[PDB]
Amino acid sequence: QAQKEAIYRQLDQTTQRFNVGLVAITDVQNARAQYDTVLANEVTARNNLD
């Protein structure tokens, strides 16, 4: 969850770079995939918790 405060924050600015124009659409759809891997690790963290 400190990675999801980080890599979503990475997504929440690579998206806000594309809304300006600094990155290509790959670096959004990459950074979402690097964000959604954080979910598929953090959900397993919440699953390996239980």
Binding site: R9, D12, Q13, T14, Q16, R17, V20, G21, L22
Partner: protein
């Protein structure tokens, strides 16, 4: 030549045509480099406009913004170099010639069409003159304008 000889010509009335062929080139070298400075500062103006929207929020990391706010303020200064370097080479282009900024009656044309003229040449092209307030160089003797100034002690008297 573009006036009528002996007429009356106002100030700034460009009626000599020095050959622009060299100076139209130096105007185009300079107005080129204005666009070389503008279009280099245009995108230097976008890269602040594209980074101003990320200030306080996340990525732009104020120094990496202020490295672009260098490059906008620095390359807009390069425009101010080049826009004046145009304004230098504009006042060597539309700087041909007539008249010198007096307004009055033009005399001859001591030059004629085709004769090469030089930068601050020895002779003159034409002489614009203004006539209605006119001087007369009265030329007093020296011993008088001691004596007539020493007649201020004995006399004179000049008034009012």
């Amino acid at each position: 030549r573009n006036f009528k000889e002996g007429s009356d010509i106002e100030a700034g009335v460009s009626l000599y045509q020095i050959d622009p062929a060299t100076y139209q080139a130096t105007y185009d070298s300079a107005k080129g480099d204005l666009a070389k400075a503008q279009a280099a500062a245009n995108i230097a103006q976008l890269t602040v406009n594209r980074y101003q929207k990320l200030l306080g929020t996340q990525y732009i990391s104020k120094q990496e913004y202020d490295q672009a706010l260098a490059d906008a303020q620095q390359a807009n200064a390069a425009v101010t170099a080049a826009k004046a370097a145009v304004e230098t080479a504009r006042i060597n282009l539309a700087y041909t010639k007539v008249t010198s900024p007096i307004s009055g009656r033009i005399g001859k044309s001591n030059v004629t069409e085709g004769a090469l003229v030089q930068n601050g040449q020895a002779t003159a092209l034409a002489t614009v003159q203004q006539l209605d307030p006119i001087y007369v160089d009265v030329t007093q003797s020296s011993n008088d304008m001691m004596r007539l100034k020493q007649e201020l002690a004995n006399g004179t008297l000049k008034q009012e």
